[PDB]
Amino acid sequence: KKNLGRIAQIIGPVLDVAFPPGKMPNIYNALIVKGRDTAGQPMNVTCEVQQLLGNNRVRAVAMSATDGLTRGMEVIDTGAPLSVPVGGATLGRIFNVLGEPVDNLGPVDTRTTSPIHRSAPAFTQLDTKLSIFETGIKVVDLLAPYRRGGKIGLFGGAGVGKTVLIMELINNIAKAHGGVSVFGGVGERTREGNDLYMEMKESGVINEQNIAESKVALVYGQMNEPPGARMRVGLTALTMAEYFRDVNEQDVLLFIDNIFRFVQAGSEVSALLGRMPSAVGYQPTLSTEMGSLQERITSTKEGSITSIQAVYVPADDLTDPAPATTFAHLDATTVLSRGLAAKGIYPAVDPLDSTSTMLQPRIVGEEHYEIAQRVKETLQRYKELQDIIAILGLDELSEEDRLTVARARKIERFLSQPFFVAEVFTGSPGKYVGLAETIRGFQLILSGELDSLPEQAFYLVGNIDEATAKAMNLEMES
Amino acid sequence: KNLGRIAQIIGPVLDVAFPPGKMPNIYNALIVKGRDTAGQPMNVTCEVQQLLGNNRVRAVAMSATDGLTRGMEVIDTGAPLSVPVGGATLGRIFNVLGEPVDNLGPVDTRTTSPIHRSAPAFTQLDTKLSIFETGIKVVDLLAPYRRGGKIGLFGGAGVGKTVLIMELINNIAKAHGGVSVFGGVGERTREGNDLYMEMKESGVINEQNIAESKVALVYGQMNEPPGARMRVGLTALTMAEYFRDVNEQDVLLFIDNIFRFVQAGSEVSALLGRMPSAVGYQPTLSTEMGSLQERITSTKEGSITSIQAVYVPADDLTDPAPATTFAHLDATTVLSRGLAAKGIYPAVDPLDSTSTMLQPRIVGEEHYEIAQRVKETLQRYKELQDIIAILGLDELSEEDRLTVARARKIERFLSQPFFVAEVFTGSPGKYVGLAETIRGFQLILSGELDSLPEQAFYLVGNIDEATAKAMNLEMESKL
Amino acid sequence: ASELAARMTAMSNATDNANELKKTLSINYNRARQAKITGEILEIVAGANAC
Amino acid sequence: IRADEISKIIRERIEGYNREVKVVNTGTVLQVGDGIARIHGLDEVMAGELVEFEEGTIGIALNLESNNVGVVLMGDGLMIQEGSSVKATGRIAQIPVSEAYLGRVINALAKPIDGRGEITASESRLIESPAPGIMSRRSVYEPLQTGLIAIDAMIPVGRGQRELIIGDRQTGKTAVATDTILNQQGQNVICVYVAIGQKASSVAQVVTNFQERGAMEYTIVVAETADSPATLQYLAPYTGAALAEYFMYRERHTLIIYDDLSKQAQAYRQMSLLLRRPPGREAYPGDVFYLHSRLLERAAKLSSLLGEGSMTALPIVETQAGDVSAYIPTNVISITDGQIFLSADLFNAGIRPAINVGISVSRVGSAAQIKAMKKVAGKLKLELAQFAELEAFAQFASDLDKATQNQLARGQRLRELLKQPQSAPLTVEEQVMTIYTGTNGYLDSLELDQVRKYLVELRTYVKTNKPEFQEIISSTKTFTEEAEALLKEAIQEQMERFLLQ
Amino acid sequence: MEYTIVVAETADSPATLQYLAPYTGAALAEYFMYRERHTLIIYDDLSKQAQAYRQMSLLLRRPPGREAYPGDVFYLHSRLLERAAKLSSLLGEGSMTALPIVETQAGDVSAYIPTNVISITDGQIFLSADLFNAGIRPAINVGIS
Numbered sequence A: 001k002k003n004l005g006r007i008a009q010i011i012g013p014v015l016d017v018a019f020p021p022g023k024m025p026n027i028y029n030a031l032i033v034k035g036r037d038t039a040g041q042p043m044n045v046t047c048e049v050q051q052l053l054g055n056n057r058v059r060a061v062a063m064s065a066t067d068g069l070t071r072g073m074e075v076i077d078t079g080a081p082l083s084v085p086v087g088g089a090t091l092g093r094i095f096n097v098l099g100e101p102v103d104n105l106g107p108v109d110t111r112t113t114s115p116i117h118r119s120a121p122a123f124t125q126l127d128t129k130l131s132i133f134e135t136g137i138k139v140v141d142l143l144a145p146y147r148r149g150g151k152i153g154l155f156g157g158a159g160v161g162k163t164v165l166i167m168e169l170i171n172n173i174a175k176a177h178g179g180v181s182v183f184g185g186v187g188e189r190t191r192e193g194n195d196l197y198m199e200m201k202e203s204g205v206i207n208e209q210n211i212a213e214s215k216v217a218l219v220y221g222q223m224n225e226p227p228g229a230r231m232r233v234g235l236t237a238l239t240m241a242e243y244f245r246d247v248n249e250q251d252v253l254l255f256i257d258n259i260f261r262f263v264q265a266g267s268e269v270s271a272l273l274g275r276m277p278s279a280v281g282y283q284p285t286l287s288t289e290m291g292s293l294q295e296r297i298t299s300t301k302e303g304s305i306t307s308i309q310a311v312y313v314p315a316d317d318l319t320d321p322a323p324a325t326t327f328a329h330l331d332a333t334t335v336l337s338r339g340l341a342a343k344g345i346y347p348a349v350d351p352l353d354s355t356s357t358m359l360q361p362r363i364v365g366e367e368h369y370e371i372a373q374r375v376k377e378t379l380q381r382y383k384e385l386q387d388i389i390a391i392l393g394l395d396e397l398s399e400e401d402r403l404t405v406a407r408a409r410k411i412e413r414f415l416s417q418p419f420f421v422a423e424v425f426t427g428s429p430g431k432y433v434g435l436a437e438t439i440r441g442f443q444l445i446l447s448g449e450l451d452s453l454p455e456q457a458f459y460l461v462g463n464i465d466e467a468t469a470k471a472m473n474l475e476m477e478s
Numbered sequence B: 001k002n003l004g005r006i007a008q009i010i011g012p013v014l015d016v017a018f019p020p021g022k023m024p025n026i027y028n029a030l031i032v033k034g035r036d037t038a039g040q041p042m043n044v045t046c047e048v049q050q051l052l053g054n055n056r057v058r059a060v061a062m063s064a065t066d067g068l069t070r071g072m073e074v075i076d077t078g079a080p081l082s083v084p085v086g087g088a089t090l091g092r093i094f095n096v097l098g099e100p101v102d103n104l105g106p107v108d109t110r111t112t113s114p115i116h117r118s119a120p121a122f123t124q125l126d127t128k129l130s131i132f133e134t135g136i137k138v139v140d141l142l143a144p145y146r147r148g149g150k151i152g153l154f155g156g157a158g159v160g161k162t163v164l165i166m167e168l169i170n171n172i173a174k175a176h177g178g179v180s181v182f183g184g185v186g187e188r189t190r191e192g193n194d195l196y197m198e199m200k201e202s203g204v205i206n207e208q209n210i211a212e213s214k215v216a217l218v219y220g221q222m223n224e225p226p227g228a229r230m231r232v233g234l235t236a237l238t239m240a241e242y243f244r245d246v247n248e249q250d251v252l253l254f255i256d257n258i259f260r261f262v263q264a265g266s267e268v269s270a271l272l273g274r275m276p277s278a279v280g281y282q283p284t285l286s287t288e289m290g291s292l293q294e295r296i297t298s299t300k301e302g303s304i305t306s307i308q309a310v311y312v313p314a315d316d317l318t319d320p321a322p323a324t325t326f327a328h329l330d331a332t333t334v335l336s337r338g339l340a341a342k343g344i345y346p347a348v349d350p351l352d353s354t355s356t357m358l359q360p361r362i363v364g365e366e367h368y369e370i371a372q373r374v375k376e377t378l379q380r381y382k383e384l385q386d387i388i389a390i391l392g393l394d395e396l397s398e399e400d401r402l403t404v405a406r407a408r409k410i411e412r413f414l415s416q417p418f419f420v421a422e423v424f425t426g427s428p429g430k431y432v433g434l435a436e437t438i439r440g441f442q443l444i445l446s447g448e449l450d451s452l453p454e455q456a457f458y459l460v461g462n463i464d465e466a467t468a469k470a471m472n473l474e475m476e477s478k479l
Numbered sequence C: 001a002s003e004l005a006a007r008m009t010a011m012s013n014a015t016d017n018a019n020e021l022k023k024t025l026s027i028n029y030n031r032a033r034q035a036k037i038t039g040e041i042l043e044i045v046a047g048a049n050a051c
Numbered sequence D: 001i002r003a004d005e006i007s008k009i010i011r012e013r014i015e016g017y018n019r020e021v022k023v024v025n026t027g028t029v030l031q032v033g034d035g036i037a038r039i040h041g042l043d044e045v046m047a048g049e050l051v052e053f054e055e056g057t058i059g060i061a062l063n064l065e066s067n068n069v070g071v072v073l074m075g076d077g078l079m080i081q082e083g084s085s086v087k088a089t090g091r092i093a094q095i096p097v098s099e100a101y102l103g104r105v106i107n108a109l110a111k112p113i114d115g116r117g118e119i120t121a122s123e124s125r126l127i128e129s130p131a132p133g134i135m136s137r138r139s140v141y142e143p144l145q146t147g148l149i150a151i152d153a154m155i156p157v158g159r160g161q162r163e164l165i166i167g168d169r170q171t172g173k174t175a176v177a178t179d180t181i182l183n184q185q186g187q188n189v190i191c192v193y194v195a196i197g198q199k200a201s202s203v204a205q206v207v208t209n210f211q212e213r214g215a216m217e218y219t220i221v222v223a224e225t226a227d228s229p230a231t232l233q234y235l236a237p238y239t240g241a242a243l244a245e246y247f248m249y250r251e252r253h254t255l256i257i258y259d260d261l262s263k264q265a266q267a268y269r270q271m272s273l274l275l276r277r278p279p280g281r282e283a284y285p286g287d288v289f290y291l292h293s294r295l296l297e298r299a300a301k302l303s304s305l306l307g308e309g310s311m312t313a314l315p316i317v318e319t320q321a322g323d324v325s326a327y328i329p330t331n332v333i334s335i336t337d338g339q340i341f342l343s344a345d346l347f348n349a350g351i352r353p354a355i356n357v358g359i360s361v362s363r364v365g366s367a368a369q370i371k372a373m374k375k376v377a378g379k380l381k382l383e384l385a386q387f388a389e390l391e392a393f394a395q396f397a398s399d400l401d402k403a404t405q406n407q408l409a410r411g412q413r414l415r416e417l418l419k420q421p422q423s424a425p426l427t428v429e430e431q432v433m434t435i436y437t438g439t440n441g442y443l444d445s446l447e448l449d450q451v452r453k454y455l456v457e458l459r460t461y462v463k464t465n466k467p468e469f470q471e472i473i474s475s476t477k478t479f480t481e482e483a484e485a486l487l488k489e490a491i492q493e494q495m496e497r498f499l500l501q
Numbered sequence E: 001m002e003y004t005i006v007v008a009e010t011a012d013s014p015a016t017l018q019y020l021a022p023y024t025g026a027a028l029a030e031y032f033m034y035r036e037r038h039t040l041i042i043y044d045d046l047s048k049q050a051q052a053y054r055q056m057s058l059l060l061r062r063p064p065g066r067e068a069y070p071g072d073v074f075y076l077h078s079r080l081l082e083r084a085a086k087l088s089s090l091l092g093e094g095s096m097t098a099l100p101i102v103e104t105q106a107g108d109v110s111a112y113i114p115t116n117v118i119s120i121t122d123g124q125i126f127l128s129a130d131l132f133n134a135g136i137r138p139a140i141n142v143g144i145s
């Protein structure tokens, strides 16, 4: 209906399309390309503009595999920004980068659709209440409380249990509170995407039949996908989430993982856009794109969009800009130090940088505030002593500093939360803990009630009474 | 004509075109004028470095990029820029192009020396080597200046360099009856303002009656363009040059910072179509320091003694601008974040700071032995300190356990207060004499005053005052 | 004798702890120097070839 | 009430309009890509003119060539047809200003993003009004108050002085910024919390805290959504600077909080990179130095000839992994009036605020703080520096000298004085009280970990018993023998009260 | 040799061919797994493929990024390592288990290519030169594996 015409240039992923000189399309809008294939000339080539580049020519980003098409294909301007199905059509459906259901189910009803991106929500349309809910993972519930409706940052490198921590968190809050629970997979290992999909099917939070009863909208974008697709799936998932926070007006659970792959797709497409590079390699616009994907998450006046975002810290580099933007852009930083996983704790979370602005006396209670304090002072002191105790041995300390090292490692192994989904990986069927644990295990450790049971006697056990029973068992076996 | 158009303006880089009748030479002052946002007769001065063909040229502007719009007139003065110099040009503070920025009466602009000039050949350089004492303890002990030399303040991240310059100017501007000049080159403007206030206070400006001011301030802003900052040093240097050849007096230069100048040159060179270099800078860094440190030379005609602050970024030495600045310096004072962290001021590690004028025969062969003994025990302590930090001083064997406490007293003793720094310290400072210095150190390094507590040496001008503070400390140990 | 045996085992563990620590720190230095100067080189070559 | 009266005002706005002879420079837009607009034609365009599009997403013309003009999109222009008549506005990025801003969340295009309604405003403040003149300005001779203890204790802030908060993330930088804002409750201090490039939920939280503390009656928050275009995200500090110039130029001394500035450098970097203006080192454009120079040098202290107000500045810059040798925290430390750190170690180890004066420094000194605290504890900064070294030295604690034992326990108790609770902004007279309690060794014999309780007991005891002390000294700014006498008196009394018990 | 189809280009080969080789291995493995059978592909070594692709990119003058490697390399490896899965009985439940050999450098698991392919796989398998020179052959470190 709009300007038909010809792509003049294709450069791998990116593509440059000329047009009628009269009307060029919008910036940021979409358009398909018919093109060709082996059998049939399908509209599989969805496309998206990026830069109108002179001579009635637009430089545009692809969305799918983009071989077989050529210069001069019959491009179709759809004019609008990329629409995407929303509604109960989402619920349960494992649909893809442009919204089509790739879950081998029916093509969902287009009676309710929405464009891909929109403006930032308003200064007033932000909420006011510093909302806090617990999870059940004790290190989080001690020293990194979670701004619900805000942003919950999952940091760490690779092979450090971040996706597994997300699986545990969704394993809790899938049948815990919250309305629709929109997982998005930005660049996920697709076998692990279908893995947790099967975990939703088995766990039944998603629905086999009558799928429109799900409160789950798993719109993955697999890691295999082209860089435009990885660049857009985050905007798709957040479009679902803001749709529900404005139309279901619901507290939406927004597991996404991991948006470093999203901004790396942005870097990769910029490198063919010819935009000059930035810090160490990335796109120059990483700041604004992370700003888009963050500022279009908010807890609204009615929808507390609680977002649980992971960020793949590349090669454990905190001063990298892809962290350095996000954990300015979010509330609950949770960096998962790899060396703790080398030691063998699962999850492997430091206390020092894993933090929150929720950790305030006037939010968590001054009691829980000082609880988290009296943990954190001791463990920071333990690190300050760690870097000089590893050289030159243990007993060159004071009696006090020796006891403080013992108690700090007490808290350390005490925060080894056994995970309920990690039984099939390690063997131990994990445990659930809460606020009575959050006060009391800390209290026994810091008072010195538990002060003779060894470091194993609170190892991989959440409940402190479970640690006492474990201590009884290991003292019995001698 | 010579009226041209400005084809491209990107930052303070201005691509000026010209008709083929005239394409002027390099370094020439160009002045687009008569226009502003208010319809004002605002002029901007811009000099040329690269002339990029087709009778066109890219220039650097010594005032802000705002105001002037592409396709505008430009009047080259047919000459390189010329700075108003003279004894009438003392007292007032003025611009890079020379305009008096003191906002009262302009100086008589009649004798203008060109800002870019020849550097004096060494046949004109006064090879006469000489010794300078400036009253600050660690300097006139261990980095004794040449009364005639070039003096470097290798400073760290804003630590003690500018306050050191203020103290030293306060101590020696009255001392040197010849001319003196501060060059505020990319200096922080409120601290240049504080310096100007101290010159009004101590009467070296003689605010009620000027041109008897043997000091002359010229300043260029941080907030000014790098086109201004990459020539403000040349402005100050030319004022000192005029006083070193025409007046040919004893001339004293205190530019701050030279690395500001370097960064401004790098800044415009990235813009004016040139490649980068190794970390930080332009590829013209060495020739920039060449122009400067070849023009600031004490001549057989007239002496000069230029001190200059060198802020190294990241507080190191492998940085290329101090890697050439050391090579162009002769009296190097290198400050330390560590000694500032322990409050010892001036926070110069005496290890790094040396001077050509520390020869035994030229400092006195006992003064030299003082200097060698302090550097020896000090460097051995700076070696030992990490072994201390892992194995305990009380373990660390006695024949070095004495020397660690000795040099530990030494450095804090050579921390001495300044007459301006009393705002930062609490006690008004001291102008220390070098005989008193070598005397106190001949006590400490020998091990006569090993009975004293160490903090009795903290922030003390003279060793007899250190004994006095020691008796006070012992008295309060009783009380 | 037991004092200077405890000092001996103190030093015989401290030397090896210093050795593994300098191993880790040497690897850290090599990686850091590599990363810094590579970022330097690719940055300046981006600035140089961006014309 | 609508459509029933406004027709006469409609006639008033219509009749009496311009019908001008305004010849304008007008450009056919050529190359828009990713927030920039390399525009064809448009010859006589002043670099810095706003350029009006088809849309209304106006744009600043930063760079300009012989053929094209580098123009940014303040407001992302999501639909701009090629060849659109994009004419400039003629004027140069002027900013409307009034005292009626005092509370409205305002956007970088001077626009109320408060929901409070539009502001009438008369003047047109330039976006690049230069620094106040060299001769024109006085030294920072007058105190400005922190509300936090240790900063006013050792490393003073002064009205006109531009101290630089620095540190890693999540270490209370924005927190101590807001604390030293809402400290200003009777000091006739305008605060301009310019929020740059972070969570709008966070800026809503801080304006919530300001609505709690009342400080949003006089403060002006320039928000910057992280989704705002990077041209706007770097422009906004200049808007805040000119807006504070609007009040400093009358008489009214003010304070500003850039928050942060590192995102300003990053956003400006993004704009310069898309503008193809080549990068300097660390992939930044070189003149982030020049940008922040023009910014911070627009913040100083007036003298009596032009209004003797001040624009004391607090630009927070963010440094990752506790570095200083990051490029922007290398520029801003040279162009600030000294810097204060928030080490993650000192924060998570209880020192909250976390200003380790070993690396922290205020480079104008006591002349910008009060004469009472001067005469009490000018020396305490260097004393605590020595205590920090010697406590690092007292790792080798086998047989400490008795004098160094006194010194270490002394500076120990002093550091314990420099502990303070969350958002408890002490009276500056109370800071004089605790600073004399430390410097006069009363607490030396006392319990070392109950010094906080000793202090709260002592401050309640003096604030009840002898509140004449704090008012006579706040009227004299001077630690006199009357102050000494009242101090040591209530010290004996409350020392008794807390010894028993 | 009936169990394998050995794919071998060596360091003589141009970096383009060394770049395309494991893609071709994955393609024929996709044909074989896709034809109902289990299969196993041995990329050896994939770090050499990273170096080859990095060279091909630099001769393509594309500005490299992290550790002077192009930003593409993660998606690049995601191609030839996400084509390796176990299908279901919808299409014949063939399986394409894979051993992408990545020879790291000095144990720097926090180097770009090793942490990259860890971020795409189903877990690490360690091998320390220290356990190898400690006589324990094979030298897999089970505490981190």
Ligand SMILES: Nc1ncnc2c1ncn2[C@@H]1O[C@H](COP(=O)(O)OP(=O)(O)OP(=O)(O)O)[C@@H](O)[C@H]1O
Pocket (backbone or CB within 6 Å): A156, A157, A158, A159, A160, A161, A162, A163, A164, A165, A258, A310, A312, A346, A347, A419, A422, A425, A426, E119, E122, E123, E124
């Ligand atoms: N919390 C855990 N419980 C049990 N096993 C774990 C845990 N964390 C890590 N592991 C082991 O380490 C391997 C990889 O670590 P992990 O799964 O944490 O990385 P990841 O979650 O893929 O990180 P990301 O999702 O950020 O890529 C897992 O396959 C598992 O064997």
Ligand SMILES: Nc1ncnc2c1ncn2[C@@H]1O[C@H](COP(=O)(O)OP(=O)(O)OP(=O)(O)O)[C@@H](O)[C@H]1O
Pocket (backbone or CB within 6 Å): A327, A328, A356, A357, A358, A359, A360, D168, D169, D170, D171, D172, D173, D174, D175, D176, D318, D352, D353, D420, D421, D422, D423
């Ligand atoms: N005196 C204090 N006592 C206790 N906590 C404090 C104190 N000062 C600051 N904090 C804490 O520091 C935490 C982080 O605040 P803030 O956001 O200002 O840090 P930041 O480094 O600025 O983080 P970001 O840069 O991401 O904004 C807050 O939760 C606040 O409670």
Ligand SMILES: Nc1ncnc2c1ncn2[C@@H]1O[C@H](COP(=O)(O)OP(=O)(O)O)[C@@H](O)[C@H]1O
Pocket (backbone or CB within 6 Å): B155, B157, B158, B159, B160, B161, B162, B163, B164, B188, B191, B340, B343, B344, B345, B421, B424, D338, D361, D362, D363, D364, D365
């Ligand atoms: N031990 C010290 N002695 C004197 N001044 C000090 C000391 N430690 C910190 N300072 C501060 O350092 C400032 C001087 O730093 P300096 O490097 O001279 O100037 P800038 O910081 O402008 O480069 C002084 O204003 C003073 O407040």
